Amino acid sequence: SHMEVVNKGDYYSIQGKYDEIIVANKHYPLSKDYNPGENPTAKAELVKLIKAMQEAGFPISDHYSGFRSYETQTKLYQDYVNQDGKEAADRYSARPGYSEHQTGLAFDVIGTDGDLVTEEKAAQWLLDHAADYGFVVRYLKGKEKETGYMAEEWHLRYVGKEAKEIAESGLSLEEYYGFEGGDYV
Amino acid sequence: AXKX
Ligand SMILES: [Mg+2]
Ligand SMILES: [Zn+2]
Ligand SMILES: [Zn+2]
Ligand SMILES: [Zn+2]
Incomplete structure (x- = not known):
């Protein structure tokens, strides 16, 4: 099943269950x-x-x-x-040419804030219902070694129909699809 | 922090 990634020129892509x-x-x-x-x-x-x-x-x-x-x-x-420097910045901010936002498929929800209780309720709502709209929370809790980044509640990645299956696994896209993650170089 |  583990499909190896295909270079399309400007970007790499892997063939999902229903979509590229x-x-x-x-x-x-x-x-x-x-x-x-x-x-x-x-x-x-x-x-x-x-x-x-x-x-x-x-x-x-x-x-x-x-x-x-x-x-x-x-x-x-x-x-x-x-x-914050470079070691702390790299934990939550991608270098130019490594950001999922450049694909046009990633969006950060803004809360305006800030009851804290209201934030975490909102963050859980996403986990429970983001798949319904083809989105997934990309940078999950305790998955920083796989994804490369610390946990981020608001960053959603559009994957489409397979969002539900991916969410139910509790895995990162790196683990689920079985492509490489981690650090640079 | 936290954008990746
Ligand atoms: Mg711009
Ligand atoms: Zn491989
Ligand atoms: Zn090009
Ligand atoms: Zn983001």
């Missing part, structure tokens, strides 16, 4: 020019999700950290490095 699954992480970088914008299918699903969360009573904004280009990433990374 683009792979972007510290081990699998994207090209510099790759500037797709946001995915219109994923975009339409996130919008539905946000309304479900808002109508559920959670303070969730109408805007989100969706697509980020290489260029945007270059300026975003170095600022976080300035803030």
